[PDB]
Structures are given as structure tokens and as C-alpha cells.
């Protein structure tokens, strides 16, 4: 009872939202390299037996919509759920190609009561984005 | 007999709160590239939390920024694991 049941027919989905290009009216430098990360993830998760679904350059609305729909799917036969977000961001905020969106709004779709098929199942959210503008100068060892 | 609606969630941030997250032009973000490498090497013998701890050490120790602008030069990064899980996670 110490380990999550991972012997379901399917390991689960693996949504990867890859954002590289942003609207000129936002002030975001194209995230060069995120293509390598997206591809690296895909292969890594495919080995872990996940149904990987990649998505590129999404807007606020599109992001929220993709998540809303995925949360409305039937995960009954799945053992978990992973979501990878690669983009610009601030504290508790993921950036869509056109505008920002709270990470909370996204995660709330997968809560125990808004998605019964995932209740009691691990919901992993890997986030590659900024959380502010502080620089860690580090210290020698 | 019920559970919190916020339980069983696990967030793997690439950096600490209030901090920047670094990315390489050709290799890809430090976080993702370390995360994938650790998964490829330990996802068959280590629990997820233990794997992410490895990811933290790799990112904190083997990476340092480089820039012609002093302001962004020689900077470090530490990933932030935020777990509301209630059991151990194994990918197998």
C-alpha cells in the first residue's frame, strides 16, 4: 500500500505543451532549444510506456481548452497522468504564445473531484519556465 | 473515508521560486536534459522522488551560466520538487 498501482492496462497520457514562438506584442524572446527538450521528453516517456501527445505554440485559450478536454477524458484504464510545460513564465504562471495563464487554473481541472477517473492516481506536472527574475550567484565548495 | 482534492499531485519545477530558469541554445534546458537523463538511467530501480533528487544534484552541480553580460554570467540553478503525493512512485 506504499506504492501507487501502476499495473493498469495503460500507464497514462503525457501531454507536452511546447511553446517557442511568442506574439510580438508580448515581448518574449523565442525559446531556442525547447525543440530538443520536447523531442528528448517524447522518447524518454515513450520508453516509460506513456501515450505521448505533443502540442506546439499554444495560446492562453488553446492551453486551457486542451487541459479541459484531457481532464474530461476517461482515465479509468490509465495508471497516471503527466503534463510537461515548456515556456516562459512567472511565479505560478505559465505563458501561452499570446498571454499568461495561472498554473492553478490548469491543475484545477485534474483535482480529485473534477476528474474522478484520476482520483487516487499520481498527477505529475513537470514545469520548465521562469518563476521570477532573481539570479543565483552561487557559492564555492 | 475520503481524500483531499489537492492530494496525489506532484510538481517538478525547473527552478526555485522567484528565480530564473536557464536554457542552452543547442542542448536544451538544464532541467529537462538532466531529468531525461536521470529517468533513462534510474527509472528501473529508483523511486521517482529519489530520481528527482539526482536531477537536483546534476543541475545544481554540473551547470553554470555563461554570458557576455556580467549580469547573467556565472549563475546557478536548483530545481524545486513540490510533492503532495501519498505513496511512492515507480515506473514499472
Amino acid at each position: 500500500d506504499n506504492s501507487y498501482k501502476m499495473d493498469y492496462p495503460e500507464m497514462g497520457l503525457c501531454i507536452i505543451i511546447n511553446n517557442k514562438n511568442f506574439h510580438k506584442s508580448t515581448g518574449m524572446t523565442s525559446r531556442s532549444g525547447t525543440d530538443v527538450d520536447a523531442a528528448n521528453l517524447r522518447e524518454t516517456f515513450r520508453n516509460l510506456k506513456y501515450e505521448v501527445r505533443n502540442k506546439n505554440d499554444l495560446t492562453r485559450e488553446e492551453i486551457v481548452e486542451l487541459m479541459r478536454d484531457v481532464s474530461k477524458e476517461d482515465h479509468s484504464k490509465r495508471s497516471s497522468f503527466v503534463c510537461v510545460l515548456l515556456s516562459h513564465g512567472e511565479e505560478g504562471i505559465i505563458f501561452g504564445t499570446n498571454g499568461p495563464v495561472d498554473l492553478k487554473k490548469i491543475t484545477n481541472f485534474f483535482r480529485g473531484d473534477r476528474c474522478r477517473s484520476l482520483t487516487g492516481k499520481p498527477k505529475l506536472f513537470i514545469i520548465q519556465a521562469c518563476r521570477g527574475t532573481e539570479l543565483d550567484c552561487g557559492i564555492e565548495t | 473515508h475520503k481524500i483531499p482534492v489537492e492530494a496525489d499531485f506532484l510538481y517538478a519545477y525547473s527552478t526555485a521560486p522567484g528565480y530564473y530558469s536557464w536554457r542552452n541554445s543547442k542542448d536544451g534546458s538544464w532541467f529537462i536534459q538532466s531529468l531525461c537523463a536521470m529517468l533513462k538511467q534510474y527509472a528501473d530501480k529508483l523511486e521517482f522522488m529519489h530520481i528527482l533528487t539526482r536531477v537536483n544534484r546534476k543541475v545544481a552541480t554540473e551547470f553554470e551560466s555563461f554570458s557576455f553580460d556580467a549580469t547573467f554570467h556565472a549563475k546557478k540553478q536548483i530545481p524545486c520538487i513540490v510533492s503532495m503525493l501519498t505513496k511512492e512512485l515507480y515506473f514499472y
Partner: peptide, 4 residues
Amino acid sequence: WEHD
């Protein structure tokens, strides 16, 4: 080189 760059940041997010």
C-alpha cells in the same frame, strides 16, 4: 546562454 538564455533564460526563461
